[PDB]
Amino acid sequence: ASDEYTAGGFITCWYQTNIVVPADAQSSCYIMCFVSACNDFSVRLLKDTPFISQNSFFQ
Amino acid sequence: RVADTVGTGPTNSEAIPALTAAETGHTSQVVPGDTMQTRHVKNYHSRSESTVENFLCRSACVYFTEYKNSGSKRYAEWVVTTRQAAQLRRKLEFFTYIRFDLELTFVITSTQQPSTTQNQDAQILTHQIMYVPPGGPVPDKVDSYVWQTSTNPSVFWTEGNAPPRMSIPFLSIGNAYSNFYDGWSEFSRNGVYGINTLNNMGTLYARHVNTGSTGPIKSTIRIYFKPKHVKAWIPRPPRLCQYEKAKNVNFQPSGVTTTRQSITTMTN
Amino acid sequence: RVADTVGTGPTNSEAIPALTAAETGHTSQVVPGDTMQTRHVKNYHSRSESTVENFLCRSACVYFTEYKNSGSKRYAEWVVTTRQAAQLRRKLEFFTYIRFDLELTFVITSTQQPSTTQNQDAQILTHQIMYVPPGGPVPDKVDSYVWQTSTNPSVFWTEGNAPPRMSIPFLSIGNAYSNFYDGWSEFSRNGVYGINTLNNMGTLYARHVNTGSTGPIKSTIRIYFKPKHVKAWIPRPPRLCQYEKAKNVNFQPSGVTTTRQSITTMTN
Amino acid sequence: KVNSMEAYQIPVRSNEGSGTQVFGFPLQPGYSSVFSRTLLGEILNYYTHWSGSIKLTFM
Amino acid sequence: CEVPTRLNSASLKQPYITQNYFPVGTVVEYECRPGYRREPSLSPKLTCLQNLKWSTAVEFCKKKSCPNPGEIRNGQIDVPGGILFGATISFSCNTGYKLSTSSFCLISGSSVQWSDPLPEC
Amino acid sequence: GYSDRVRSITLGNSTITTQECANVVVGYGVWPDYLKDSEATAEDQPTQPDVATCRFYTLDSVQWQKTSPGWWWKLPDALSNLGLFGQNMQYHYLGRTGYTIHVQCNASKFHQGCLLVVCVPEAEMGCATLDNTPSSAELLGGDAAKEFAGEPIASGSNKLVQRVVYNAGMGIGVGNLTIFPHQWINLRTNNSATIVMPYTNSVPMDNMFRHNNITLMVIPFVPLDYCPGSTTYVPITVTIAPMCAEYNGLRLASH
Amino acid sequence: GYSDRVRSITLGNSTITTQECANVVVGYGVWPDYLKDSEATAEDQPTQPDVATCRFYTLDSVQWQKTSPGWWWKLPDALSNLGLFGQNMQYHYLGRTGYTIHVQCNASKFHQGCLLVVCVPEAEMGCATLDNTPSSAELLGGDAAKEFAGEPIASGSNKLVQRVVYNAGMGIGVGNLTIFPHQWINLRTNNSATIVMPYTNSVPMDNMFRHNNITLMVIPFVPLDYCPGSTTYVPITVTIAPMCAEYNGLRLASH
Amino acid sequence: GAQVSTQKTGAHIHYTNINYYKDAASNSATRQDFAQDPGKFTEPVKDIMIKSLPALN
Amino acid sequence: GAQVSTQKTGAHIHYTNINYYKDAASNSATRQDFAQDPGKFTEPVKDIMIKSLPALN
Ligand SMILES: CCCCCCCCCCCCCCCC(=O)O
Numbered sequence A: 001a002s003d004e005y006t007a008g009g010f011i012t013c014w015y016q017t018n019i020v021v022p023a024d025a026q027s028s029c030y031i032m033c034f035v036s037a038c039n040d041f042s043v044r045l046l047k048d049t050p051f052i053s054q055n056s057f058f059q
Numbered sequence B, C: 001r002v003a004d005t006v007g008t009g010p011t012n013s014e015a016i017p018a019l020t021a022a023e024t025g026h027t028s029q030v031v032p033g034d035t036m037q038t039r040h041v042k043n044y045h046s047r048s049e050s051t052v053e054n055f056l057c058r059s060a061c062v063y064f065t066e067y068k069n070s071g072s073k074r075y076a077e078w079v080v081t082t083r084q085a086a087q088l089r090r091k092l093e094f095f096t097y098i099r100f101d102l103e104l105t106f107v108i109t110s111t112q113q114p115s116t117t118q119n120q121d122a123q124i125l126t127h128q129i130m131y132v133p134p135g136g137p138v139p140d141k142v143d144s145y146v147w148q149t150s151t152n153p154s155v156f157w158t159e160g161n162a163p164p165r166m167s168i169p170f171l172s173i174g175n176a177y178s179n180f181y182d183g184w185s186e187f188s189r190n191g192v193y194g195i196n197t198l199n200n201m202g203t204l205y206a207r208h209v210n211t212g213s214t215g216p217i218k219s220t221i222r223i224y225f226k227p228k229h230v231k232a233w234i235p236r237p238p239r240l241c242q243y244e245k246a247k248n249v250n251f252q253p254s255g256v257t258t259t260r261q262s263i264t265t266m267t268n
Numbered sequence D: 001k002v003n004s005m006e007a008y009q010i011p012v013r014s015n016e017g018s019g020t021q022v023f024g025f026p027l028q029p030g031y032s033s034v035f036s037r038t039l040l041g042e043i044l045n046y047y048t049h050w051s052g053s054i055k056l057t058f059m
Numbered sequence E: 001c002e003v004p005t006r007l008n009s010a011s012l013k014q015p016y017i018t019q020n021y022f023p024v025g026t027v028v029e030y031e032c033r034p035g036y037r038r039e040p041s042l043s044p045k046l047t048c049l050q051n052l053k054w055s056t057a058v059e060f061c062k063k064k065s066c067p068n069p070g071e072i073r074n075g076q077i078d079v080p081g082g083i084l085f086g087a088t089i090s091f092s093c094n095t096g097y098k099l100s101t102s103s104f105c106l107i108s109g110s111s112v113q114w115s116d117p118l119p120e121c
Numbered sequence F, G: 001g002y003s004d005r006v007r008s009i010t011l012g013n014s015t016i017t018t019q020e021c022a023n024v025v026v027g028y029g030v031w032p033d034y035l036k037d038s039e040a041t042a043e044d045q046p047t048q049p050d051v052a053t054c055r056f057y058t059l060d061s062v063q064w065q066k067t068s069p070g071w072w073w074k075l076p077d078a079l080s081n082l083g084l085f086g087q088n089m090q091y092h093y094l095g096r097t098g099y100t101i102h103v104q105c106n107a108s109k110f111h112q113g114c115l116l117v118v119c120v121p122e123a124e125m126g127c128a129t130l131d132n133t134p135s136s137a138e139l140l141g142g143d144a145a146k147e148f149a150g151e152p153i154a155s156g157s158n159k160l161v162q163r164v165v166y167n168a169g170m171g172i173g174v175g176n177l178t179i180f181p182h183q184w185i186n187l188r189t190n191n192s193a194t195i196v197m198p199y200t201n202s203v204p205m206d207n208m209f210r211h212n213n214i215t216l217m218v219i220p221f222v223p224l225d226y227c228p229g230s231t232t233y234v235p236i237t238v239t240i241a242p243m244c245a246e247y248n249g250l251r252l253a254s255h
Numbered sequence H, I: 001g002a003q004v005s006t007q008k009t010g011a012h013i014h015y016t017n018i019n020y021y022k023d024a025a026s027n028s029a030t031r032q033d034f035a036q037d038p039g040k041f042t043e044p045v046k047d048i049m050i051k052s053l054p055a056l057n
């Protein structure tokens, strides 16, 4: 959860140089990002997801 | 035990651990010591609470219904299904096929209803919970002959005691439970479509064995399911949308996530 | 076992055991046999009740709250904190950092409230106590869906039975608990200041699972904390002043001790 | 953009400047809206403590 | 079906408010109450299902954020509860200066603004 | 010497060659095989054609446009009317096979885009109306491809399938699908993607006409783009080869 | 297998990757190291931060135009105000370090050009007026790059540096500079050039604020050229990492 | 016929278990099976991929 | 797998203990750890100080 004591940091990306595109080639591109846990990853206290919800028993 | 970090130093080689192609779909097995200098620290952390068992091995209410000692509704019935609630359903839906034993627990609570009958001195109520396997004689009335429970299993509980609990083995004609089904009841691709076709767990009934008092009383039974000896296969993504029905996966379309100000915003 | 005394005799030497300098801060390790003649007596006394465990290993009420079966307040909540009471707080504050397992015990008692409803014949009340870890879905109402307690831990108790008790491990992201903190929530030295910043133990809820009777009833739950497996570091002086708040150490100034007649008075 | 696939594309194009920013977000897998619904985030939201390294792959 | 479920964030759209008969398969739409801002991912619609029960409902709106408080000269601002709709900031002064004392984020027109302006100290 | 960007696959009387390929994904690390004697339940002897059934079948092609949401295919249904495979699964009551999927796209060095190619086991889908269930025609497209929809399908008294691309018709997250054996076609890196899938099910054999085990989903995550002057028609082709296929319960043909 | 066109460099908490690189030039065949006990002169113990000081610092970028003469950088001056390196050399009286220089340029297969990237030790420069000497501001540019001039600087009563590109401000020959460890960036062959320089001086340590040991000179020998339609803004970036840095004589900060 | 096994304790003391029923579905839960093999989901490829080498060469 | 230990009796007769749960946080309290070392609080000085000798000489 959001706690200012356990702050994480900031992740940013910047243009190092400039995109170099030849004539007759689109100059607007897209990047994609994937995230994965490392070998040292670990979690430690079962709880209930905030997202799941219900107003009354289904069917 | 989780893997400890390894100490490394500077490097000017031709080894390119960071550069890779995700077109293959192979997740890169890089560690922090590959793209920076690291210290060697022993890691004593443990993935003991992340095992499938510890994850699904908790009691969760899957239904509750109310029956009275007078009037019309004298007994209660429930068609066994784990899709009635949202929390346990969403925890179970992480996997395509699951095999698990079940620890059932029942909580029964009574309440006096508003009336006008004078001189009310009740006695202790006893409850009977009868399970009928599919194909059995379902009770048609509260004083039905079927309540004999010769072959059928039954549990009798007197109010004021500890809640009843029993253990049920892996019941299935298949080799594992199916959380999802992509087929039809008939071979002609018509009729019931979905996990409803596979479902066939029978019906559960409940009644007051005695009236107890001359005044009205309403009882409510709560069903709790704790999975144990869990084995699971083929994981799948968690339900982004909210559930709507118990017999089907029908949903209302929703966005992937929640919107922020711009692509350079550190706050929600 | 405590150290036995040693028999000594007269002395006319140059050894000066009594004379010392307390400027160093070294506590003098002199025994009575150094400044007088003593007999040799074996000492069988034992410091077994002075150990950290035996000191803090006792049940102590840290909070109690009241909820009803009708009206507005249908359920009760409490943000976990050991600073609510004075006795256990002052016993714990002897040390800067403490690491300990917790044995929680709950006492629940009901009471009939004055009304005018005739023909009151109640049934046995059952109570549910649900613990929500921080970040969980807190109940917004008494018939909330969150009460399913799938992942969340819960305890169900029927009145007339033995009080519920469970054991909680050392929960902390650090390596020890902190009774005192000298810092701010933000790195800019602004915002919350004190032990409140470190606190993050979640919230505890409680409700009646059934109305029970047509008349009003108020229940009160009491929380008891017994520390076990205690390990402590850096001792500090006991609280001379009286406590005022739970989130901070703010106090009203008080004298060091109580005043007598003169400096040569043998009485209080 | 969350109601389409455009939520997954990072738009980098050639410009007459250098050193500008592409994106930035905090390291809060459980709380940040960016990582909340990822597999890692959906698994974290069932727990209370997390500890380990994070891998980000940019294609 | 009965009356649609009440939600703190949004309010039933006109004219559904003045309607008491809802057949099965009837859709109702909501709208964000002041200040509350609409959430683009969630859609504010509910359908009466066959069981005469409305579809699952979640907060379709979120509290609006008041502007940044600023920086009072020779003064310290205390923000215990964020800067969302309904929060309260506290204005204090340093040792050696004399100073309103508090400001409240309230709906003023079509957006939310602070009440008392920054004092002088 | 060798490179690793060239790969040939030979099955039956068919061969597939590739000059720009990524690796080959192998299911869940399991290679398809036959059924063992200690895990079977049906008692009559199975038939194993092994040549005609185990060959590359090439379905139709689909045009990839600047605004295409994506396509999906049910493999037991896709090959139902094609070759001996269709005749075998038609007469027989029970069937068991593993599917190898090869999806190929061709472009230049001036074209850009990205496809996700994923095999979903048990892809149960939903309906536009919350009450009611989807029709067989909407869920199953044979000899053709079904297309997702960019915008939500309207709810009325209908049996149409919810085709939203962001919910993949299952209400889940399209990004999280990677949990299933998948691959990418990045037009700057690889022309084709190959996935080998074993037989996944909860029972040893199953009727191949009423249950569809796996579903192939080709979804463009980055739209196709090019500058005027270059080719505007870019098709996508899918070749499916059944592997280790065995059948049981010979009965009158089912239409 | 391997190629030799890919190279990664890791220093401190920073990493540099390259897909099209030539070899790595190593100074005069000497790798930077620390000072030995048999060659030191100062007697107090040195400080060796070794992590924060030894990391990649990225200066600003410069646009390469069809008519750019070239740029030069004084390394002790360039990193003077950047990071702990600047704070260390500020408080201390003596310093000793080796500099690794990475210069990167990005383009297409339709762009042409050629840069010489050279490290000159003791690049003493001249003044437009024969009498008088150049001003510190003209010789040293911090947080920025100094540019050469295509045509000769006018002589008057001024302290301006002679910036003629053909004389490199030293009056010598630009072609003969290759005697210094250098590299080329040919836009048809390599994106970046990397040079590793040890500590060269006539004394063991030296004050890093009044003497600049080496100077980096990036000079386009063949002008940038392209046809209309392709990208017109092509920047050049320089990353410098100090190596084996030690300091002596802690004293009050010098501004 | 009892089983003695180690408990879950912190890093940096045995327990006893007897089965009373005869169905093997009535035993306690198996909470101490710490075995992993993420090579089926991560790295499901056919040809091995060494980390330091280029992926496509 | 039981533990037999001595009890707390007066100066001048064994007890038996079995653990039933598998968490090591559910055991009883450790009441019999009689170990002391007051040299950290009393006498924390660097140079040793003999009792009979003068402190500052
Ligand atoms: C004396 C009372 C006995 C009650 C017995 C109830 C048995 C219920 C069995 C339920 C098994 C789990 C069903 C899972 C369904 C599924 O996921 O396909």
Ligand SMILES: CCCCCCCCCCCCCCCC(=O)O
Binding pocket: C080, C081, C082, C102, C104, C129, C130, C131, C153, C154, C155, C166, C168, C171, C177, C178, C179, C199, C201, C204
């Ligand atoms: C079924 C009910 C479960 C209730 C669980 C309650 C857990 C409370 C944990 C409290 C731990 C001790 C807190 C110490 C705080 C401190 O000193 O920093």
